[PDB]
Amino acid sequence: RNLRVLLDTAIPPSFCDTVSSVLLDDFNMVSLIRTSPADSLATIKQDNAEIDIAITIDEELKISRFNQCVLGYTKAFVVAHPQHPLCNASLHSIASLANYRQISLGSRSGQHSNLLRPVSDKVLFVENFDDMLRLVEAGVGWGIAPHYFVEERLRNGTLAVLSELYEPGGIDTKVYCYYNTALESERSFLRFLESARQRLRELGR
Amino acid sequence: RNLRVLLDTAIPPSFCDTVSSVLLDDFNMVSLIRTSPADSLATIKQDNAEIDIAITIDEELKISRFNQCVLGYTKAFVVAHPQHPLCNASLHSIASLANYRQISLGSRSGQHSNLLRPVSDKVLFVENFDDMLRLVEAGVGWGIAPHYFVEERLRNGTLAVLSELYEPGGIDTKVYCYYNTALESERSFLRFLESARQRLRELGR
Numbered sequence: 466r467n468l469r470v471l472l473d474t475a476i477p478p479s480f481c482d483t484v485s486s487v488l489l490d491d492f493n494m495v496s497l498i499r500t501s502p503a504d505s506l507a508t509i510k511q512d513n514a515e516i517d518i519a520i521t522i523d524e525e526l527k528i529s530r531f532n533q534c535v536l537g538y539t540k541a542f543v544v545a546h547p548q549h550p551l552c553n554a555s556l557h558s559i560a561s562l563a564n565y566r567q568i569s570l571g572s573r574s575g576q577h578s579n580l581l582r583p584v585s586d587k588v589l590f591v592e593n594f595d596d597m598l599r600l601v602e603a604g605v606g607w608g609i610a611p612h613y614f615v616e617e618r619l620r621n622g623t624l625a626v627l628s629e630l631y632e633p634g635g636i637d638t639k640v641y642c643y644y645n646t647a648l649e650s651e652r653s654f655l656r657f658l659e660s661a662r663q664r665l666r667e668l669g670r
Numbered sequence: 671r672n673l674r675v676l677l678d679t680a681i682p683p684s685f686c687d688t689v690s691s692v693l694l695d696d697f698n699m700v701s702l703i704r705t706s707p708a709d710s711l712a713t714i715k716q717d718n719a720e721i722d723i724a725i726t727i728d729e730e731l732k733i734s735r736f737n738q739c740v741l742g743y744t745k746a747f748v749v750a751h752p753q754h755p756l757c758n759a760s761l762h763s764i765a766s767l768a769n770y771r772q773i774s775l776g777s778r779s780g781q782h783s784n785l786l787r788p789v790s791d792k793v794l795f796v797e798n799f800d801d802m803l804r805l806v807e808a809g810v811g812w813g814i815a816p817h818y819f820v821e822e823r824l825r826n827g828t829l830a831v832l833s834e835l836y837e838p839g840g841i842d843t844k845v846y847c848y849y850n851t852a853l854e855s856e857r858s859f860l861r862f863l864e865s866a867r868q869r870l871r872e873l874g875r
């Protein structure tokens with residue numbers, strides 16, 4: 466039947482291309498759906514959503530009808546205006562992120578997970594990463610965005626990284642694959658998982 | 671003054687050697703202390719402990735008087751007796767870990783974090799990884815142990831890996847460094863962090 470897949474907006478396009486191309490080798494109908502990382506898990510837990518697979522970075526221990534595995538790894542950076550008060554990016558600043566305003570992703574359910582829940586008390590929720598960085602470039606507050614979403618801005622100087630001393634080279638973020646328990650026995654899914662994983666390791670190095 | 675450092679038993683010896691050697695370049699008195707990963711964070715939060723640094727894998731968002739950063743990455747494997755009912759290591763088995771008995775690390779406080787809290791309902795707590803693997807080799811139940819603690823047993827066939835399809839090559843586990851806020855301004859700590867991180871990246875590749 467039709468296979469409904471969910472890819473949050475934190476998944477790099479290279480991951481999206483690999484997932485889409487591999488799925489087409491096995492399945493004959495695939496529905497790709499984009500969502501916010503803060504709304505990914507909340508969506509699959511909706512019975513009426515009938516989501517079969519969900520590629521997202523949000524982490525949750527046990528979800529009914531779904532099993533969790535790891536597909537690959539991506540990077541994420543704490544970014545702010547180049548003239549933000551925390552531009553020194555020292556250790557005292559990284560600890561003081563809880564005191565400044567954060568531009569975090571808002572969840573339709575209003576509740577977040579430990580991974581995506583904002584760190585500071587002053588928070589300004591949004592719906593996507595474009596609205597986030599639009600406010601970050603304005604100096605309103607700092608945020609967390611994937612690498613591919615800020616690589617252009619970093620080289621253009623319009624943004625700066627603040628999380629280099631927390632985790633050099635970026636904040637390694639796992640990309641999970643939540644798949645309905647019904648798929649654990651179908652070889653079609655196993656072929657996709659092994660191929661997508663292998664193609665991602667090749668693209669990783 | 672004296673610098674008290676905490677390294678849980680999940681830190682590979684190569685990490686311990688690098689941390690110890692680097693600290694000696696800056697500080698003139700260092701007290702290295704070992705603890706269980708399930709007791710690491712609970713220890714630093716004791717005011718009477720006077721811990722200055724804690725190298726552990728246990729993760730906690732915000733801890734008073736302490737700041738969190740990333741030192742490196744290690745591997746961890748789900749292991750079981752080679753003749754365990756879940757020896758097939760397929761996808762249906764990885765999901766059924768919640769049904770079988772787990773040999774997890776017991777915390778002195780009785781409470782665990784999302785990372786270290788057991789997944790299954792049938793749990794048998796212990797105090798260290800030696801007691802864990804001693805029971806795992808007996809077929810009593812499965813457990814989670816670092817790579818260096820099971821590399822010998824895997825090659826000898828006395829143990830088997832079950833988490834290969836969850837995350838190929840092992841479960842990447844971040845190694846955090848919780849340091850007292852007082853150290854964020856002392857160049858001695860910055861030199862240690864940069865050197866230990868750089869020496870770990872060199873040993874990583």
Ligand SMILES: Nc1cc(NCCCc2ccc(F)cc2)cc(C(F)(F)F)n1
Pocket residue numbers: 475502522540541542543559562580581582584609610611628631636638
């Ligand atoms: N909120 C959020 C969270 C992510 N994990 C990393 C969070 C851990 C963290 C937070 C603040 C720090 F100073 C240092 C580390 C990723 C993303 C992503 F990738 F979507 F941008 N967003």
Ligand SMILES: Nc1cc(NCCCc2ccc(F)cc2)cc(C(F)(F)F)n1
Pocket residue numbers: 680707727745746747748764767785786787789814815816833836841843
């Ligand atoms: N309890 C515990 C937890 C660790 N994180 C990884 C847990 C995530 C997980 C659990 C069960 C699975 F089937 C697959 C993944 C590491 C360690 C270590 F490294 F100390 F052995 N222990």
